[model samples]
Target: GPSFWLGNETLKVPLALFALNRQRLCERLRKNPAVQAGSIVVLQGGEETQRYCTDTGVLFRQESFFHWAFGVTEPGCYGVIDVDTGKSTLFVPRLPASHATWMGKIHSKEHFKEKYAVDDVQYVDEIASVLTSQKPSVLLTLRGVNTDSGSVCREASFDGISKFEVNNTILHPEIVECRVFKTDMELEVLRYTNKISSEAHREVMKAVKVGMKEYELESLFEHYCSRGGMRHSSYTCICGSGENSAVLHYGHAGAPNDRTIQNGDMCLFDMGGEYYCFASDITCSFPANGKFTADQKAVYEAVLRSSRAVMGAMKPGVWWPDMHRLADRIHLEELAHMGILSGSVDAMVQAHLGAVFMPHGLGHFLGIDVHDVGGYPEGVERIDEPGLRSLRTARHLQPGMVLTVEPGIYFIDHLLDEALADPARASFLNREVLQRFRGFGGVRIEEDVVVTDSGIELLTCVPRTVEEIEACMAGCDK
Candidate 1:
């Protein structure tokens, strides 16, 4: 079987997955009027980076599009797929002979040939000659700005690529749309990633105890995931306790996971395991003491209710931001019960108070990149509404689309300070009750789901309910 397997335990991803992706892409490009018959796609893999331009290797993560088209692991390579023939070729950067002394053995072209299951492989220096001989009408070089990060994707070019006709615009959107709806194999990879990540979180929950540093949990998660074969993480592990949980994107170098887990602190742990370029983003909020206080119990249930509501209503043809607002409304309705606000739910919605509690969007597309591509299509504009403005995607739900349903509620002092000072907002917001929740932190229930014909298939498997979480942390099997 021509598959890429890490070991006996890890999933064996078939080379056929990338082959199908290339075929799907070529089939789409063939129908485009701008792409002629002799068109060929060119892509560059992500290069190995250094630590602050030092010799220390920072490791390499392949460019999402390159990995989608050709699942190659080695750094600094070029891949080509012909539109007419659907033939795939790879060009490796042929290291110098002296490199053999410092590094290990250099592989022949046959190495990648069998590994990637590509039709042809050649030296990087020979790419110009090989393509010139192939005589392509126009070269489709990879280029695009990541719709989520606003950072541009890596472009493909060679020393003599200028001699040939090249068009960068044609490849970006075509490949982006292809990457949106995953295939069966892609879904399998995501499921494996989610399973490993979910189990890691479960183990972290069991190991977490008061008086431990937040980074200790981060280290535990990394160890558990690495032992489970998730060698790379999708992003940084955000492990915070108490007020540290309220910060949206903490756990950076400055505000590292260094806090002491207090007796009554709320624990917010957002982490994901990456396997073979597929990503899984999951967030779990738990009580440090393994027993939720009255306020913690209410807030946890409130966020859980919204998470359940969004999951219950999610299906095809539903606008994504519509689900975002659905989660927000449920949160606000619960706020009335919590006595944090006293007013019509719709009125609070009109005031964008939901955005005050939950500043970020409901969730985002999850795949090769945690915030996946095809979010904002060519001309689709982002919603200008406050709660929905920060959405990573503005598209409608559709089958085969994979996304994260992460509904959360955080009590940040800054957001509260601003809202409480506002005349209109202060009129309805119960200042006394709201003041008590200032140091309560937050709760986030994140899960990976795949959109099916009627609804979504929940891919993440973890202890979800308040009882389940409490029992699990208490060392009782629930």
Candidate 2:
């Protein structure tokens, strides 16, 4: 029986989401002459394996594309879709009867067929034979690269089956483009996941204290998400405190989250949870002692303002590069007001001075993967500039697009030292004021948003304002 949780009445994933995705992909494929000639999209799910040499197994999560098409959580599965007709078929793993002793009961093929709402279901052994019957002119497979992470996503290789001519060039971009514009059912799942993640962040904020270890907060968030029925996190939890907060992607093995939180230290806790293959990414920065110091408040508020400003200006047809500049201008203006930056704010922004404080891009696409696919599509290349180069997607905003609006300011020493070395950039920076806050760390306010025809809708609901954060930390805001 399915359990009800994560703000929904049923734990079962709405199969309609994947069905709609298949429909969209099929619609796009129909318009393509190559696919219309006769094509079949093939995707392989992730496989289960042991960790290192030990017998202990890693938790299985299906591949993004396979999950997008079939919504199957189990591993060692395959998905096939007719690009012309939009007919989807799932291939489930057929385990031996002995497997029922260690693993749970093996589900019947009909069970999966009805559960996933697919046109057909079969065992993995029949994939080659079944495809041979269709006699497709081209077997469409995925092979693309995620520009943001520089990771290559390879397509499923049909080695022995030499019947159809395999074509990856046409499938990769087509599927990646389809993933960018989420369907209605996807928006529902995203909203619910974001709601659960927001509540988990609030719980962590309420429990934060001066003496608590950084890992404690991490544990609190993970626990809260699990209690709400989210079994996996979108990514590694970054619970960096004090100077460690300056390091992006903190909380790794070497530095692990073992630092003690000091009274005045600022904590940048970036964590998110995954529900039904959909993900939510949110970050909340506040003082460890439940109240922000003067310096902390200044930096936090600047990033918050940048986040809000970007959200306000985001709508269909808005350029993402311009939004990045807008965030930079806002943060630089705040730095100039605090006397940490000298000269005209616009001039410094043109000089890429904002990279000194915030080196990372404003944010990235958020969905199945934290840094989701379709960032840099074909014909759309990455910019070569400093801050703008880091942007994940340069495409104009469109309705049904969901992304993160994260603006940050970190006092990173390496970046600061580089700025000081450059004579041209040094002219814009106020070294005296900057030197006083070397270990001041950073502040990042992240929220998930979806573009609409009129404006953008915020998916995250964490307390962001200084007053609201203080109140929430003090456990005074219900």
Candidate 3:
């Protein structure tokens, strides 16, 4: 039988995916000493927020943890999972009858139960009574700070329920650790989203020309993703050209992607799409003229080589920090070969000189959230070193781990100015050579990969090599 469809489309996420995730969470929780047998894990889904004071509102996206466990698409939902039996119950909002007249047919509790594959469903108002009947020893709720963003994730507040003890610290880590590893079903969804995003990138590449604005590329990519059935982008689209490419997190309002593409400009577009709450982040860097210039090709190949080197080294049991260092060394070597630096790669890397070019970490875990959770697990602390400090994850890789291996080289003025001001660091840099490429922008090659028992699998497939990129753009022109 076909899966249940959402609004206006045949797009439907498999109910089995959420079921497997809940099962995995239950199994992990059972093994933990902190979780009791009769414990009930509770989470509140995300609520819709208005864009401003008006009726206009932001599109609803479920909370990462809640979406992981329940996969509910609607707003104002809650979920409960029994650790002993691994059974789940969902509580959905009861809308007024007018909802049917304006917002289409109102789905009953049975409809949500069948669609989400939960064992039972009830009205949100009945949650306190339901918990009272379960007689759970503990109500496990989520409360913790995301190490990467420093954002606090609060658990579902049961104002009326006073019988059960609420435990936050016990369940947060167990659930987060479970999310680090992807199941086969989760990987399938991620791979599908990435494939769609990759093809969308290709379409944008074909449509790009010398005179187009950067936002046009952004619009083109989003349009393709939407046409392919994705309703949301993983994050804000970054379509940077010329010097704007050097800004790592460009495309904000202060420095929007309103720049016009010139003939010699290099474009770095970092965009991704989300399907059923799973995300795909892929970046493509190329020339606006459909061919790389001598300088542009040099930087592009260097970043590409760095990206591939990290992928080649990824596997189960490999430390993520070491992979980041390896990419830094490879990029520095390429820069030295280009006469941009004059010192030993080892000494430069040891001095944290690579942070000047690649300010951000190698990459991060990609899933329901763009900068997904579980990067910094319990007992695992983020390093305070220069390039390493920005890393989203420093733990050793394991099978089922999905991450992005993005290596970049940018010529940001502030970083360069700071580097030049330091006498010790400036001695190794080739100032004259670097001066010529101040406005040259940057190049970044990003691809998604999953760790496997044997080695790794590349999830993103797009033209990367200089020749391949040129050929692709040329074909599009025809």
Report the number of the highest-TM-score candidate: 1
Segments in model 2 whose C-alpha atoms lie over 4 Å from true places: 1-12
Candidate 2 residue-wise lDDT, 1-478, digit = tens: 2222345442445677788889988888888876656688999888898989999999898788888777788888889998778888888888999889988888999998887888999999889988988888778888887777687786786445566688878877888888888887788889888988899999999998888899998899899887777889988899999998888899989889999999889999999988877899998899988888888888898998899899999999998988998999999999988889889887887788888788888988888888888888877788888888888888899998999998899998989899899987999888899988889999989999999998999999999899999999888946
Off by over 4 Å in 3: 1-12, 476-478
Clashing pairs in 3: none
User: What's the lDDT for residue 34 in model 3?
Assistant: 68
Predictions in order: lDDT: 0.90, 0.86, 0.89
List the lowest-lDDT window of 10 residues for candidate 2.
1-10
Count the clashes in each prediction. 0, 0, 0
Candidate 1 local Cα displacement, residue 129, angstroms: 0.3
When 1 and 3 are scored with lDDT, the better candidate is 1
In candidate 1, stretches whose alpha carbon ends up further than 4 angstroms from where it belongs are none
Q: In angstroms, give how far residue 404 of model 3 lies from its true place.
A: 0.4
List all candidate RMSDs to the true structure.
1.2, 1.9, 1.8
